[PDB]
Curated annotation (Swiss-Prot), chain A:
Family: Belongs to the GatB/GatE family. GatB subfamily.
Name the UniProt record assigns to this protein: Aspartyl/glutamyl-tRNA(Asn/Gln) amidotransferase subunit B
Record's catalysed reaction(s): L-glutamyl-tRNA(Gln) + L-glutamine + ATP + H2O = L-glutaminyl-tRNA(Gln) + L-glutamate + ADP + phosphate + H(+); L-aspartyl-tRNA(Asn) + L-glutamine + ATP + H2O = L-asparaginyl-tRNA(Asn) + L-glutamate + ADP + phosphate + 2 H(+)
Enzyme class: ligase
Native organism: Pseudomonas aeruginosa (strain ATCC 15692 / DSM 22644 / CIP 104116 / JCM 14847 / LMG 12228 / 1C / PRS 101 / PAO1)
MF terms (GO), sorted A to Z: asparaginyl-tRNA synthase (glutamine-hydrolyzing) activity; ATP binding; glutaminyl-tRNA synthase (glutamine-hydrolyzing) activity
EC number: 6.3.5.-
UniProtKB/Swiss-Prot annotation, chain B:
Protein's recorded name: Aspartate--tRNA(Asp/Asn) ligase
Native species: Pseudomonas aeruginosa (strain ATCC 15692 / DSM 22644 / CIP 104116 / JCM 14847 / LMG 12228 / 1C / PRS 101 / PAO1)
Positions annotated to bind L-aspartate: E173, R219, H449, R489
Annotated gene: aspS
Single GO BP term: aspartyl-tRNA aminoacylation
EC number: 6.1.1.23
Amino acid sequence: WETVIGLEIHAQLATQSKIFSGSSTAFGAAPNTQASLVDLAMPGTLPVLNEEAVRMACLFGLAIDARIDRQNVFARKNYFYPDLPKGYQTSQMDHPIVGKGHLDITLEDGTTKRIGITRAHLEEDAGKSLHEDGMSGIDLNRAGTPLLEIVSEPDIRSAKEAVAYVKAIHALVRYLGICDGNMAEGSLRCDCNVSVRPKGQAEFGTRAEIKNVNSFRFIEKAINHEIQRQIELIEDGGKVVQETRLYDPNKDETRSMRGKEEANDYRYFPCPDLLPVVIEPEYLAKLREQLPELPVQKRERFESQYGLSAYDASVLSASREMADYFEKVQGICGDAKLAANWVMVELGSLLNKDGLEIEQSPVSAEQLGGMILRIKDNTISGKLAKMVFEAMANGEGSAXXXXXXXXXXXXXXXXXXXXXXXXXXXXXXXXXXXXXXXXXXXXXXXXXXXXXXXXX
Amino acid sequence: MRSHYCGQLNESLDGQEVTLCGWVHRRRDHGGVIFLDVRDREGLAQVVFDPDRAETFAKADRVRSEFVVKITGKVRLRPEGARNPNMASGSIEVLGYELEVLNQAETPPFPLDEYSDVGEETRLRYRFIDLRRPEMAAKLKLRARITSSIRRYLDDNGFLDVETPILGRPTPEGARDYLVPSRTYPGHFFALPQSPQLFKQLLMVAGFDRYYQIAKCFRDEDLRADRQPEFTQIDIETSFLDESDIIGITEKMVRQLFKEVLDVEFDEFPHMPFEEAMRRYGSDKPDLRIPLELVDVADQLKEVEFKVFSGPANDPKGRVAALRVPGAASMPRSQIDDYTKFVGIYGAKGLAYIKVNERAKGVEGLQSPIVKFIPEANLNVILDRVGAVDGDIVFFGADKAKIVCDALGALRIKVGHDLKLLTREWAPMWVVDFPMFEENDDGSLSALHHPFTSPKCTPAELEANPGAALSRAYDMVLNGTELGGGSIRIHDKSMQQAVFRVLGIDEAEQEEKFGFLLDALKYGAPPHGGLAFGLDRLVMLMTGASSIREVIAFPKTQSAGDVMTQAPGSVDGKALRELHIRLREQPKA
RNA sequence: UCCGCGAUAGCUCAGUCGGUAGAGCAAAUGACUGUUAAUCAUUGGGUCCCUGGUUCGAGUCCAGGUCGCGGAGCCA
């Protein structure tokens, strides 16, 4: 069996004003408060394309290494639904913003596979229907919100690969600063065009378009449970029909919302209100200079030049802020493995305490840089790390013995707790080093050997 | 050879020697005196050992927990300062003449009686030592007493205990059937019955005048708390009887049962119509322990400035009902907010209220933010109608009929229990006169129960206006819970065709869905009617148990599996092949 | 996807600003003549949910998983 799937991802761009309207984007519980005259599709009103919208569009186009057309025209997707005000969705039929690109997705089975993206054009969002009294309520607060429809080439195969692609898209978009990426608030959505086929015969099972898929887990489970379903369907023969299916995480079953009786004729044609936007090579010349370093290539840059493991490189390159924050400390000259080490474990705990969106807030790189500076040059490595670790990070912002004296401390400890009796069996002798370490803080490496020699 | 039961040692048997066998609950060693608590089906008793026969002492020191032993001794009357209230036999002891260890016992996973912190999964996994606990045993024995009483009554009244087959034919519409792959008929399945309904009807056709059966029932639905996949039901069906006779016999049964077992008496069961029940309680299963009642008041609040009242007041598809809670004006705003959020869960947009403090001053005598939009006269006749006086609070539910009925009905029961406003006696009832039809979301008409339910009117008044038709159906309610219910069936040709015509079902579906039934109905079916009780819940009520699993010997969890026998389990591929079926747990990349 | 809580002896459950898994109950041995959910002393027992990583050292800190309860979100 060979399962050929596809992915249609809608990404909500983080722009202040809407794509054609002047209303804000992020909204609260207040309904119809984020809707001017343009969004309500009043008769005689006209739309004007947003600047940072197309900017971010061709930005994603440049990041994904796709052949961007010099000209792109907005077309109309005429369909009737209460959420859609003007009766047509302003999309792009011919000549999209970006087309034919490739994204390197990193999985766990060795090779980081290359996936195709056929296009990524600019769309617009519609209203939302809610559960209420009777009739129903439509809110146009999200209507008019700029959307980026990243359509992937059907080169993507297994479900795990699909999850990898969604995560790669999410990561790239997070790095570019185009969308929030937070699927919980409803910014990033996707659909899956899954179709299976028996290897050998050019005949195959009917296409299944699973719409409205939230989490990555939901993606994997739904895609699997759809693949196996199609496998059964073709094995039995029966009736292979093209349908619009849905997935609920509660029962892990796939239900059909609408049966596709025929190809929906949306009647596409160039919008007479919107003139074709011309993207000249100068825009791309400046924006490519503005292009940030890709995460997929950032972890690999963490593999090549800086001594690091795949794991630590990936988890360090999980975000741009953390990456830059770490690279500064490396710039201090703190040992790569050890500087990164300090970034991971120690400050990571306090970062887990508040989980502060940006690591620009809690601790500066110059401070930890100064700590490692004190640990390397000014002082030797060992116990000096342990206390400053406690004191320096939380509160104050201000920046070692190796004698024989510890032996004199080693006797009194044995007198404190009844340690003389516990010496009989080997077990663990950490409790012996505890009292000495607490009394001194000094020099653990010597203390372990001395305590081990003194025990039995 | 046992002489007497441990938990049946009264004070009267003093000066008699006894031999009793049982388990060793707990053992107390004082050195000079050894105490053993021996337990059987009837309860616990204390046996005492003094080393004056040190051989028995040797057979006393080795004994540990849950050892199965046989002890013969003499019952000695214990001192006044040693008497035990917890032990039913706890005013006497038995000095052990001779002991014998019938069988040894490994350490029981969990302890008996509280506050031994067993958790439900562990208690279910070792259910065979859990039922040793006297409380569980008392519950099950009580169940046995119940089935005993019911069987005695039904037998004495000319009912026939006849068994109906479990493996029957599968059919949709009603509920998911448990299927059983057929070894002899490949591709075909048997099905576990949801109720012996069809079979009992056939038994009426078969000439058996009166039938009853305590039958096993199976539903493959996702389950609720207090709901199990395998549940026992008391099926009853009779011929040549109307609704009055059936309700008579059944009511008599319930009374006789409650007097035989718990020794309580029920007077008479009030017959309340569905319409009335919905009117003053907003529920098809009223809790008659709570005297609090819903009173409709929307008619006088039609042309009023306040709009959340006037809205549904002029809308026929709903009402505005009030609920007086007495002496509850001292209630804090916290509780009010909690209750508003509570009624929120049943769909009510808001819970309006009036705190009634001083009636002679009018409007300045009613502290509330709503009082301004409503005239003084209407207010006064409302207060007059609801029965409210000084010190009370009046709540208001104003919405679609279903929503207000459910939300205020539940607010009613909730605030009913929370303020302890009920009489603690038993309160039984009958719910009668249901409607025949209802709309089915999309439209059209449909029967709530079954299309075989007898309407109170004629097939003409029926084909006239189907909405005005009441059914001859009946449910029995105790403490606001539905013990069971049934109805008298239709055996009339023209009537069956009348309800068939009125529901939109042509003869295709008539034949495909009910053909064998209609066939059996055509060859001379008598006037028959029946009812069924959920025996489990009945025992649950009669015991006072919290859950239904407490009145079932070996229950299953909410996900239909039982943790003790680890069922359902895996079966080898051979038995899978012989039954003509395949699995589909195949490896994916 | 997200928030809170939780996984640690037979059972229940605690464990700080990182140093031999404790306590009640149960079990084993011993003591005690009135307990009755006995007590007291002593002994025995366990993979701190899985993997990887951090540190002189991990139940504890970092990252990624599994499972139970409830809440939020989505359901063009």
